C-alpha cells in the first residue's frame, strides 16, 4: 500500500535513512520510523509511506506512521498544549518550574519536594492554579504533562478522600 501526506506550506520536511525531520515556525521534530518493509520518503511536496506488504501488522504501522507525521506537522505550526489544574484540600501545594524540571513542595504536607524532569523543548508555564504544557513534539509534551500528574500519585491511601494533586484539564 501507499499513503501520501501533503506537507503544509508553513512546513518543510527533510529525511535521511529512517529519520524524518519536520521544521516549522514553531520549531522542529525528528523521529525514527523503522518497521520491516515500510519506506518513508519525502517526495517534493509530499511525504510518502509505502510497502509491498499488506498484512494486518503492516497496515497497523503504516496507519501509525501517518498520525505520527501529521502530528509533527501540527506540532511545528500550531504546536501542542495540555492544560492542568493544581487542586489541593488541606495543604497548600507549591508548584514551580526550576531549571528543566517542575518541582512540587508540601504535597499532602510532605517535607520532601517531589519533582520530575521536563522532556525535550517542552515549555511549562504556571499561572496560579493553572498549568499549561506546550511544545512541537507531542511525544515529549504529552509525557511531561502525564509525568506531572503521575508525580502526585498515591497508593498508600484511599484516593477518593485524598484527591490532592495536579490533573490534566485539557487535552489537545
Amino acid at each position: 500500500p501507499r499513503v501520501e501526506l501533503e506537507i503544509p506550506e508553513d512546513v518543510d520536511a527533510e529525511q535521511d535513512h529512517l529519520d524524518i525531520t519536520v521544521e516549522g515556525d514553531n520549531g522542529s521534530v525528528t523521529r525514527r520510523l523503522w518497521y520491516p518493509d515500510i519506506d518513508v520518503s519525502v517526495d517534493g511536496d509530499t511525504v510518502v509511506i509505502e510497502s509491498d506488504e499488506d498484512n494486518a501488522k503492516t497496515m497497523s504501522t503504516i496507519g501509525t506512521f501517518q498520525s505520527h507525521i501529521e502530528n509533527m506537522f501540527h506540532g511545528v505550526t500550531e504546536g501542542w498544549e495540555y492544560g492542568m489544574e493544581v487542586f489541593y484540600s488541606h495543604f497548600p501545594m507549591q508548584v514551580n518550574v526550576e531549571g528543566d524540571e517542575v518541582v512540587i513542595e508540601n504535597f499532602l504536607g510532605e517535607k520532601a519536594p517531589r519533582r520530575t524532569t521536563i522532556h525535550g523543548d517542552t515549555d511549562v508555564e504556571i499561572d496560579g492554579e493553572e498549568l499549561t504544557v506546550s511544545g512541537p513534539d507531542i511525544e515529549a509534551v504529552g509525557q511531561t504533562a502525564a509525568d506531572i500528574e503521575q508525580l502526585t500519585r498515591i497508593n498508600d491511601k484511599d484516593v477518593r478522600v485524598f484527591q490532592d494533586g495536579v490533573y490534566i484539564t485539557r487535552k489537545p
Binding site: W34, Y35, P36, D37, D39
Partner: protein, 142 residues
C-alpha cells in the same frame, strides 16, 4: 598483534551463526580466518529470550567451571569453537588459526560472505553482539 589472515570477514550486520558455520569450514580447509567488527555481528529473534539464554550460560557453572565469555569478542569465538572438533589435533589447529576482533585492526576492509548479511530495512527482531555484552555486564571497550 599481527595475524597473517588469508581471509578477513566483516561480521557487521551479519547473522553470527551463519558466518561462524562458514568460517569453521574454511579453517578446517587450511584457511587462516580473521573475523572483524564482531561487536556489530547480529543474531535474529526476540531480544528478551536471546539475552535470557546467554545470561543462563553465565550463571551456570561450579568448581569444575563453565567459563562463558561476555565480550562480543569471545561470544563469537566460542560460537565458532562449537562448530569445530576443537579437542582433536586437526580441530584445535583450525580453531587456533581463527581469531575474532572488536572493530577492524587491519587496513583492508573485510569481505561479506554470501547468505550471511541481514537487511535492517526488512528486520526489526534481532540484536547486536555488543548489545548482548553490555547487558551481560561487559565493559564496553569498543
Amino acid at each position: 598483534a599481527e595475524f597473517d589472515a588469508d581471509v578477513i570477514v566483516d561480521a557487521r550486520d551479519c547473522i553470527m551463526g551463519r558466518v561462524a558455520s562458514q568460517v569453521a569450514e574454511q579453517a578446517l580447509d587450511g584457511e587462516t580466518v580473521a573475523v572483524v567488527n564482531a561487536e556489530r555481528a547480529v543474531i535474529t529473534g526476540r531480544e528478551e529470550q536471546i539475552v535470557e539464554k546467554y545470561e543462563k550460560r553465565v550463571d551456570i557453572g561450579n568448581d569444575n567451571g563453565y567459563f562463558y565469555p561476555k565480550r562480543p569478542d569471545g561470544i563469537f569465538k566460542r560460537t565458532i569453537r562449537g562448530m569445530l572438533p576443537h579437542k582433536k589435533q586437526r580441530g584445535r589447529e583450525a580453531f587456533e588459526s581463527v581469531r575474532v576482533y572488536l572493530g577492524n585492526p587491519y587496513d583492508e576492509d573485510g569481505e561479506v560472505l554470501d547468505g550471511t548479511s541481514l537487511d535492517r530495512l526488512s528486520n526489526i527482531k534481532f540484536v547486536t553482539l555488543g548489545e548482548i555484552s553490555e547487558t551481560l555486564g561487559a565493559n564496553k571497550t569498543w
